[PDB]
Write a protein that binds this DNA or RNA. Structure first.
Ligand code: MG
Ligand code: MG
Ligand code: MG
Ligand code: MG
Ligand code: MG
Ligand code: MG
Ligand code: MG
Ligand code: MG
Ligand code: MG
Ligand code: MG
Ligand code: MG
Ligand code: MG
Ligand code: MG
Ligand code: MG
Ligand code: MG
Ligand code: MG
Ligand code: MG
Ligand code: MG
Ligand code: MG
Ligand code: MG
Ligand code: MG
Ligand code: ZN
Lengths: 146, 174, 213, 60, 37
RNA sequence: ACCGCUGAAAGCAUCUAAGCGGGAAACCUUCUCCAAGAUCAGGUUUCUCACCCACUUGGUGGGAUAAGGCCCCCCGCAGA
RNA sequence: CUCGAUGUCGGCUCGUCGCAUCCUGGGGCUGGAGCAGGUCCCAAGGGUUGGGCUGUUCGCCCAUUAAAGCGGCACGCGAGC
């Protein structure tokens, strides 16, 4: 009998990730593992373990010069000829929180429980977050030496 | 070779460095510039400008001879300010001052006015000759390039706005 | 500085101007109005002004909506709508309780009139979108007013979204742009507006000043 | 791999160090100590780390 | 300009330079402007 | 697309590698309309702002109400 | 692939899409004086008529037009004619 977690054993906490010079790939990966609870030894792929992630300073994320011009974001409305495209560089002016949040939500598994995982994610643009009623501890990026 | 040659400073009363920055001030207005990050700017014995670099890369040799002739434009542009000199050719074409502005009669059905921006002062010397002055070399030559394109280049009668001394190309016509 | 008023369409008639031309006007009773609420940007997020219009008995208005008038000191009206202003300098000329009348528009000014278009019921495709139909003779079996084809074949195996078809028509918010104001009658509270004004004879009409001029 | 990284070592080098020290505990029980007894898992990390070769990138 | 995938100088004062990721020929005679596209 | 200014690597030159401009019915805002089922289901306001019963005393079952709406009734230029 | 059935040209009706662009918009070169052009590059937002002949597609012709573009979609569309 291996461990399968009960309901009421998953204890959640609150992290906050600054993004002042962090690239979009390193930060979306480290937020995807931290929301799902891969860093916890009581992991189970069918249980929404994992903590809250507050991403502040998303307008200062590290995107290269050739990606604010040539990397496109596509939406389609369903109507014919309804394909629209916006560059990253004209999304980092209006909605910079959507660029970080889209990179996280493509790295979660494509299933039903990821729609409950993504309810634990708050992405903001400035250096100020409203969740000071809780006590978010900061989370810096670490790589385990080998 | 350019960049491996110091910057002669006639007056330069506050040629300073504050954390990868530079400034200049003198008989004219002040000017600012920020050198690219590998290139260091430093002093000679005379308090002048001598720039240095790490050695022998494709990208550090380029930013060194660039950033020499951008700092020396500041200490020239404050002492000896830049004046471009332009002329008007063609019969009936002329130029006047409407205050600080500069009107042209270039054969159109409306007088073309050119609003002079900050730091730029216009002055005519003749109905077919005028000058554009200032302290920044890029900002002067940008205004003088807007005036050069006011008409289409005409290779048949030579009617247009020119720089003085330049020779445009000419065709035979009919 | 976009001015606006609420009103009731009263029908159409014709009138003669100084050059002896005939001008089809549409009478709009730009009735007396009142403010009752001011949307400020620091409180509500935008800049607008409510406008209350129409006589009503004070027993026909329920207790949740009656109290919204008691906070402004105004007797209850029938209609209630907002005039959207620009995003700055909100209400330096609108106060709560201010009486707006019809003579805020001048003779010869332009207005944009928005109301609800008349209903046409469940309308077929020749009335709603203006198709052509098949012919009236030469063999045409039972297809004299039918829409014809609605798609391709096995590629694409779907009707595209947005295909024009039969359905209901009317009851749409329709704005008519750049209508000339022939005469404002301050004695009667009536604008004479040149042209057509959407609605049945008695519906609610918002008369705003034009932006296209 | 989640519990080795609470003790600054990858899973890559924990399995190497537990074969270089002669600890034949299977991965079922090694993952049941990590949930039920965490202080008895730090000791198996310090056994596997000390038994690991000093330059892990140098050839044998 | 002339837009041809083979550009080469025609007279002896046509320079051959590279700007914005494509190879082009500039000169004084304007009928010798060429680029690759 | 095309036209530039400043300017090296390349003592010259060059719209370019750092940096900055001009540039069209295309693109994005502007104008008209739909739109919080936008499940992140929003905002500003106002009204009621209250009882009783049983049981295995529970974020339990029922009953009766306030604000309020629906059904029926008279109709409509609103409508299968 | 389909023979224990995938109904074939042209027309009408309704579309939708590509750009190898007919018109309009922006340019370089010209053996471009001007007016009109030739040629190349950029551009798909909208517009691209009505008749004679023929089952026609195609094509010739008539009178115009800012122009009368070329193509895909079972040579789009017969449980729509
Ligand atoms: Mg899978
Ligand atoms: Mg009806
Ligand atoms: Mg008919
Ligand atoms: Mg029949
Ligand atoms: Mg019939
Ligand atoms: Mg360019
Ligand atoms: Mg424009
Ligand atoms: Mg609305
Ligand atoms: Mg949606
Ligand atoms: Mg709501
Ligand atoms: Mg069968
Ligand atoms: Mg041409
Ligand atoms: Mg093209
Ligand atoms: Mg088209
Ligand atoms: Mg558009
Ligand atoms: Mg006949
Ligand atoms: Mg077609
Ligand atoms: Mg067919
Ligand atoms: Mg066809
Ligand atoms: Mg057929
Ligand atoms: Mg069929
Ligand atoms: Zn040449």
């Amino acid at each position: 009998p291996t461990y399968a977690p009960k309901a009421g054993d998953t204890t959640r906490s609150w992290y906050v990730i600054d993004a002042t010079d962090v690239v979009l790939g390193r930060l979306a990966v480290a937020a995807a593992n931290l929301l799902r609870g891969k860093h916890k030894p009581t992991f189970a792929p069918n249980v929404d373990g994992g903590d809250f992630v507050i991403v502040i300073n998303a307008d200062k994320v590290a995107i290269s010069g050739d990606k604010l011009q040539h990397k496109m974001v596509y939406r389609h409305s369903g109507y014919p000829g309804g394909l629209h495209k916006r560059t990253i560089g004209e999304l980092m002016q209006r909605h910079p929180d959507r660029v970080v949040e889209k990179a996280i939500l493509g790295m979660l598994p494509k299933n039903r429980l990821s729609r409950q995982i993504q309810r634990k994610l708050r992405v903001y643009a400035g250096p100020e977050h409203p969740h000071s009623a809780q006590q978010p501890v900061p989370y810096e990026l670490k790589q385990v030496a080998q | 070779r350019i960049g491996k040659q110091p910057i002669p400073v006639p007056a330069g009363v506050d040629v300073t460095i504050e954390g990868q920055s530079i400034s200049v001030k003198g008989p004219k207005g002040t000017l600012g510039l920020t050198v690219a990050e590998p290139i260091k700017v430093a002093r000679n014995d005379d308090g002048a400008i001598v720039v240095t670099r790490p050695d022998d890369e494709r990208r550090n040799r380029s930013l060194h001879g660039l950033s020499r002739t951008l700092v020396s434009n500041l200490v020239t542009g404050v002492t000896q300010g830049y004046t471009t000199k332009m002329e008007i050719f063609g019969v009936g074409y002329r130029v006047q001052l409407k205050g600080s502005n500069l009107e042209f009669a270039l054969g159109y059905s409306h007088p073309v006015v050119i609003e002079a921006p900050e730091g730029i002062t216009f002055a005519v010397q003749a109905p077919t000759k005028f000058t554009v002055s200032g302290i920044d070399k890029q900002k002067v030559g940008q205004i003088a390039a807007n005036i050069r394109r006011l008409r289409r280049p005409d290779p048949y009668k030579g009617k247009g706005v020119r720089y003085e001394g330049e020779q445009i190309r000419r065709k035979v016509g009919k | 500085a976009r001015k606006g008023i609420l009103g009731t369409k009263l029908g159409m008639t014709q009138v003669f101007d100084e050059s002896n031309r005939v001008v089809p006007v549409t009478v709009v009773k730009a009735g007396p109005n009142v403010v009752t609420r001011i949307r400020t940007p620091e409180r509500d997020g935008y800049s607008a002004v409510q406008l209350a219009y129409g006589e009503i008995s004070p027993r026909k208005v329920n207790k949740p909506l009656t109290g919204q008038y008691t906070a402004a000191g105004v007797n209850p009206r029938r209609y209630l709508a907002e005039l959207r202003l620009d995003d700055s300098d909100a209400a330096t000329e609108y106060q709560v309780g201010q009486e707006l009348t019809a003579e805020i528009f001048a003779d010869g000014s332009y207005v944009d009139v928005t109301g609800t278009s008349k209903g046409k019921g469940f309308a077929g495709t020749m009335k709603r979108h203006g198709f052509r139909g098949q012919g009236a003779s030469h063999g045409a079996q039972a297809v004299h007013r039918r829409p014809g084809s609605i798609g391709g074949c096995a590629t694409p195996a779907r009707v595209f979204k947005g295909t024009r078809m039969a359905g209901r028509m009317g009851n749409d918010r329709v704005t008519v742009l750049n209508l000339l104001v022939h005469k404002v009658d301050a004695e009667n509270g009536v604008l004479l507006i040149k042209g057509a004004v959407p609605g049945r004879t008695g519906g609610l009409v918002m008369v705003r000043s034009a932006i296209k001029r | 791999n989640a519990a080795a990284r609470l003790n600054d070592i990858t899973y890559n080098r924990l399995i190497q160090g537990l074969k270089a020290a002669g600890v034949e505990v299977d991965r079922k029980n090694l993952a049941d100590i990590a949930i039920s007894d965490p202080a008895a898992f730090t000791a198996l990390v310090d056994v596997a780390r000390a038994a690991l070769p000093e330059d892990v990138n140098a050839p044998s | 300009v002339k837009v041809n995938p083979s550009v080469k100088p025609i007279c002896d004062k046509c320079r051959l330079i590279r700007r914005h990721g494509r190879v082009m020929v500039i000169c004084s005679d304007p009928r010798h402007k060429q680029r690759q596209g």
